[PDB]
Design a protein around this nucleic acid. Structure first.
Length: 167
DNA sequence: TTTCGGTGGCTGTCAAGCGGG
DNA sequence: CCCGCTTGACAGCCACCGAAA
């Protein structure tokens, strides 16, 4: 009734801006079938997905509900893209504000899976702590729960032109 | 007004299993 | 076997809503 679902067709429709769930709907399969074809045969990772490969912690649900998780993700996306040209006005505003809060109050983000949710962390697991000289350019505290890759060193460091962006 | 946490539903991946070739 | 799917469970993504400033 149609053509076999190949990786190539999925990639073409993705380049045209359709997401994997919509492609599944087009082909009468589950999102998982589209994902499987992409995961098994090497489909193009999105920028966010690339950032995920270098995510420094094993976080589980509901850490994604903490603003620190979301803001750090946005930061990784920025460092990966290198400008705000691909993100919404909201992502930009929130990220710049978060950066300001971290520098002006001289904080870095720490992750410990044992932190239970608390006011101002609906997801729990994260906490802001004072910066140490040993932290260098990182926005995060490296502890026993941190996996920091070479790329992660760039992703989770300040942008080089950070002073100028906030003005 | 605008800021910013909390929240929900949607999106995507992984593991285990099933059926047909 | 292998390859393409489906379930079920879970991790992550992003704009909207509303209170607070």
């Amino acid at each position: 009734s149609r053509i076999p679902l190949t990786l190539s067709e999925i990639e073409d429709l993705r380049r045209k801006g359709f997401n994997q769930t919509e492609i599944a709907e087009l082909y009468g399969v589950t999102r998982q079938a589209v994902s499987w074809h992409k995961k098994t045969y090497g489909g193009r990772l999105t920028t966010r997905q690339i950032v995920q490969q270098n995510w420094p912690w094993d976080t589980r649900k509901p850490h994604d509900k903490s603003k620190a998780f979301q803001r750090l993700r946005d930061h990784g996306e920025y460092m990966r893209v290198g400008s705000f040209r691909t993100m919404s006005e909201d992502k930009k505003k929130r990220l710049l504000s978060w950066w300001k809060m971290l520098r002006d109050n001289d904080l870095v983000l720490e992750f410990d899976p044992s932190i239970e949710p608390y006011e101002g962390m609906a997801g729990g697991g994260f906490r802001y702590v004072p910066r140490d000289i040993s932290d260098d350019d990182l926005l995060i505290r490296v502890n026993e729960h941190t996996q920091l890759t070479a790329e992660g060193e760039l992703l989770w460091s300040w942008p080089d032109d950070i002073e100028e962006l906030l003005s």
